[PDB]
Amino acid sequence: KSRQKELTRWLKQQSVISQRWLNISRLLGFVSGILIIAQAWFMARILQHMIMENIPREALLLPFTLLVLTFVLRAWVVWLRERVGYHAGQHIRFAIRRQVLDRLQQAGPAWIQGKPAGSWATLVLEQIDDMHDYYARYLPQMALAVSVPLLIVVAIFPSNWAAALILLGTAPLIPLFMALVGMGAADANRRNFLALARLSGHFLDRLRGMETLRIFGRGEAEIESIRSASEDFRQRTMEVLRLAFLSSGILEFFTSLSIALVAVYFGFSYLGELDFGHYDTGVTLAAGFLALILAPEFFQPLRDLGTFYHAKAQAVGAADSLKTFMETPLAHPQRGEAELASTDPVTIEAEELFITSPEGKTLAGPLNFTLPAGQRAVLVGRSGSGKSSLLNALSGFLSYQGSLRINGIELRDLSPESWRKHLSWVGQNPQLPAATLRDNVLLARPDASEQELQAALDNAWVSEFLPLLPQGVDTPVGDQAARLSVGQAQRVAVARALLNPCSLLLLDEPAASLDAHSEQRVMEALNAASLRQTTLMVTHQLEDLADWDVIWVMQDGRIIEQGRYAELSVAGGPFATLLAHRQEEI
């Protein structure tokens, strides 16, 4: 599959930020193999002096001092190498999370709303942090796994070439057998891939549907389903592991064969049973200890690389969903540089809009309307008829190909930073991102006096329930407004809409999903706040629309009828039928 080739090239391209840290860790893994050889050389020379030449320990204080010194440098370049590796993976996640958040803030609310907010947190938190061990552990180890084994062979070859061929002779053999085994491990991992993916979410499925198992009397008979689906899961994944523990056992076989052969070759060559391998200078004891201390260290780099190979998978899975995200061709609404300095209710005239999603799909079809300054309007229709898409296009969150001239200036030529200064709006869901309930209201005006601050509170009828809160005005606004109710979380969204002078006010569905009492409270505040400037509303509450200047009913993103409420209420058009729809439901 070329997917891995493209993904693993993306991973290598994201590592240029930490190239300095990945070069030091490559350099420190080459020093660590030099100290492993030095530590094995001094140990072998001390042992030979004491065993063969029978030298007392107190005469070997120099090789002991040099041996203690390598043991301390080894611990230093392991502490150093663990911290250099962390900086390698940190600076990559910090520079990708900045790219993910930049592409996600520029794409705006139009594209963010496509997936749940917990789906984005998985991409920004779980997926980006999954690429840490690839750069912190796997990539450094993938270079230490090729340097240290070659240093071991280069150091044993001058001492003895038969001991250097036992270790080197398994270098081609180890991957030749893992690949031979691995192709049998992809058979069992192919014909079990589907059956093992249906059995993985079986516990969560039977556990998300315990209410349905309760009300049918099947609670006890879904324990024999858990017993059967767990037995099948084990007997199907143990088949796969019988081929994946062989691949890990190829390295342990060649690690055990090499230590046995180094011992038997050297042990027999001391007794005269063997006469090859050395350079006719005689095989010494320090040559056999050097090869025997370094025999397990030849395969250690490869064994640690085998415990990090998962970190390549979860960093390719993470890099999968991070590369599709980063290469979506979504096109943003273009931002002009003109500034609107009217500072008064604006007039919206529009013809042939074709408002389009960032993905390029068209959301509202041919739109033709006008809106004089100070004239409130309301959009009515069925669910999925592109009623909200017009509000988002007026806010600047969506791209339109046509003419949307506000106050005589087309929107796409208007700077978004200054346009939103004259724009206030109230969505169906009152998203409160600030710290405290007072900071939610003061979000519009970061610096204002308490006189107008209080004026915007009681006007929105939020002061009605302030004493009910534990702290009052400065109540700590809980995450997702958990502390507040949905009814109270809406009247505080209204408060910040009213607090800042607005040259256009866009209500999405302020009264929807409200309780009994607050529904009038939000309407009373807004119905009196829709007169001070031009306003456009969207609603499904058709009962009290007799006051709004124009009714714009639309279906499939096309405004069908217009005019005052009384005209199209009894004209028998789509609105009259739509009004009759609400009568079916209590």
Binding site: F71, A75, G108, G249, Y270, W425, Q431, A493, I586
Partner: protein, 555 residues
């Protein structure tokens, strides 16, 4: 630590497979040590013996030993991985059966306060973590302890002051170093889960509130606040890796101190004799090989904290008390039940054939929760067929009531097992006959009774799920049927079909229906309008419409 007691007792079901997976973890890890210390002695004995000792040195016994130690280290690791993973999948099965049997008696009510979706993703994750207790905690810690105690006992047959020095060093860092690093990393390990979940709440707030922040001009002031939480979160992760760096540097110096001491102390003499030729290398190569036992030991104790945390969440959740208790009176299933209800403080009597409709003003219905005994009522008494509702055991209560949920659950199983849920004993043709009568035609095509539904398979639509719930309620036929807004968010062309399906399919049943939609109420006897849990008026559609009342305004 006492939190793990209920789950360690679950291990007695598979005590021989769990203990065999540790026995092989020691045999493998003693063969690793024994292969390198027998090799190190064999080289020293061979070198000292020399060419002259070719016939007096028995070199066939050590040579047959390095071959044995190499085979049992190679194959001991393979079978240790197989036995320890097979036993881990049998603990997982026993953990899931144990924690499902405990979440059933408290299914609707005990889990109500917890918001689901995240509670259950926490339950599956906690059961998985409780499964790692054997491989990742018990097996490394117990294996390390008895490998040290065998090389300390084995080496003590040569020298006591040397076996208790290598064993003393090794056993002191098995008991001191793992706890001393858990304590050091305890502060930054909770400062890690605070700064991570704080960054997550500041991120979804910045993403969900992206429309509000952009227009009020605060999307950048809240972006640097989010980026200052990451900066603080990346300093807590750096401090954690600076402790893992110290743990590995220290473990390399402890294994260095054991080698240095064995080199120096065993040079004076091993046992009685001074100048011990080949016995110096038997001790320095044991010290060199024996610290592989202590390699996984600090991450085993570190991971133990996560297992204790998960052992509390699962234990405090499954040790709650079930709101309702069903008495095992073994009452036979009733037929043609006549639900009568008083001061529950509504009161309403449903005869054994009446199709009641309840017009509650515009979540799951509270009246139907009490009928299925989700929880006992606080005020009145509920009687099914002139007998109290609490007098029926669970088996009979689930058989005299056939409720359709508002939230139809589509299990991941096949289409056959989504219908055999209602009636296990029904034949295959019965499932086909009733999937037609209900109007679920597209399902039966291309061998649909074996088609995978739910997650991992085809998803049904809102109007097509509603036909599946009614399909179960009809297969699991019961005298009393509790509809729960069956026509809600439903197409008008199919809402009539559902209502017509209700009228003809369930004609000879005690249908009770809770809705807020007025369509098709003319065929319902004794329409009831309910406001704020209070009954306003009752009567047939004609009778309730003629007199002025709440039904009239709506109509």
């Amino acid at each position: 630590m006492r939190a793990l007691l209920p789950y360690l007792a679950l291990y007695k079901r598979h005590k021989w497979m769990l203990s065999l997976g540790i026995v092989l973890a020691i045999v493998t890890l003693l063969a690793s040590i024994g292969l390198l210390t027998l090799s190190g002695w064999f080289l020293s004995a061979s070198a000292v013996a020399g060419v002259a000792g070719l016939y007096s040195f028995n070199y066939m016994l050590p040579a047959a030993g390095v071959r044995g130690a190499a085979i049992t280290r190679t194959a001991g690791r393979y079978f240790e991985r197989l036995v320890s993973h097979d036993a881990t999948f049998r603990v997982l099965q026993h953990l899931r059966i144990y924690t499902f049997s405990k979440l059933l008696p408290l299914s609707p009510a005990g889990l109500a306060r917890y918001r689901q979706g995240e509670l259950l993703n926490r339950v599956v994750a906690d059961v998985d973590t409780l499964d790692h207790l054997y491989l990742r905690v018990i097996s490394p810690l117990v294996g390390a302890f008895v490998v040290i105690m065998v090389v300390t006992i084995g080496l003590s047959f040569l020298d006591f002051t040397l076996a208790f020095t290598l064993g003393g060093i090794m056993l002191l860092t098995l008991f001191l170093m793992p706890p001393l690093f858990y304590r050091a990393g305890k502060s930054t390990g909770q400062n890690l889960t605070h700064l991570r979940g704080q960054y997550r709440q500041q991120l979804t707030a910045w993403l969900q509130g992206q429309a509000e922040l952009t227009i009020f001009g605060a999307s950048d002031r809240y972006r640097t606040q989010l980026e200052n939480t990451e900066i603080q979160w990346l300093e807590a992760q750096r401090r954690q890796s600076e402790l893992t760096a110290l743990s590995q540097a220290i473990m390399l110096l402890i294994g260095a101190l054991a080698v240095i001491l064995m080199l120096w102390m065993a040079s004076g003499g091993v046992g009685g004799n001074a100048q011990p030729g080949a016995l110096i290398a038997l001790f320095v190569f044991c010290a060199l090989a024996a610290f592989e036992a202590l390699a996984p030991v600090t991450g085993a104790f570190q991971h133990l904290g996560q297992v204790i945390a998960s052992a509390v969440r699962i234990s405090d959740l499954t040790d709650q008390k079930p709101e309702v208790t069903f008495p095992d009176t073994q009452t036979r299933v009733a037929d043609r039940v006549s639900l009568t209800l008083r001061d529950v403080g509504i009161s309403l009597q449903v005869n054994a054939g009446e199709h009641i409709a309840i017009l509650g003003r515009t979540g799951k219905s509270t009246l139907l929760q009490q009928l299925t005994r989700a929880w006992d009522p606080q005020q009145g008494e509920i009687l099914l067929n002139d007998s109290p509702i609490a007098s029926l055991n669970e088996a009979a209560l689930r058989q005299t009531i056939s409720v359709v949920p508002q939230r139809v659950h589509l299990f991941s199983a096949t289409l056959r097992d989504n219908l055999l849920l209602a009636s296990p004993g029904s034949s295959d043709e019965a499932l086909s006959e009733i999937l037609r009568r209900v109007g679920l035609e597209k399902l039966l095509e291309d061998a649909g009774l074996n088609s995978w539904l739910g997650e991992g398979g085809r998803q049904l639509s809102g109007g097509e799920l509603r036909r599946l719930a009614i399909a179960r309620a009809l297969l699991h036929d019961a005298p009393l049927v509790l509809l729960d807004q069956p026509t809600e968010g439903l197409d008008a062309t199919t809402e009539s079909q559902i209502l017509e399906l209700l009228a003809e399919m369930m004609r000879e049943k005690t249908v009770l229906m809770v809705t807020h939609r007025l369509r098709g109420l003319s065929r319902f006897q004794q329409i009831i309008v309910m406001d704020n849990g209070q009954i306003i008026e009752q009567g047939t559609h004609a009778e309730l419409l003629a007199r002025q009342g709440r039904y009239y305004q709506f109509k």
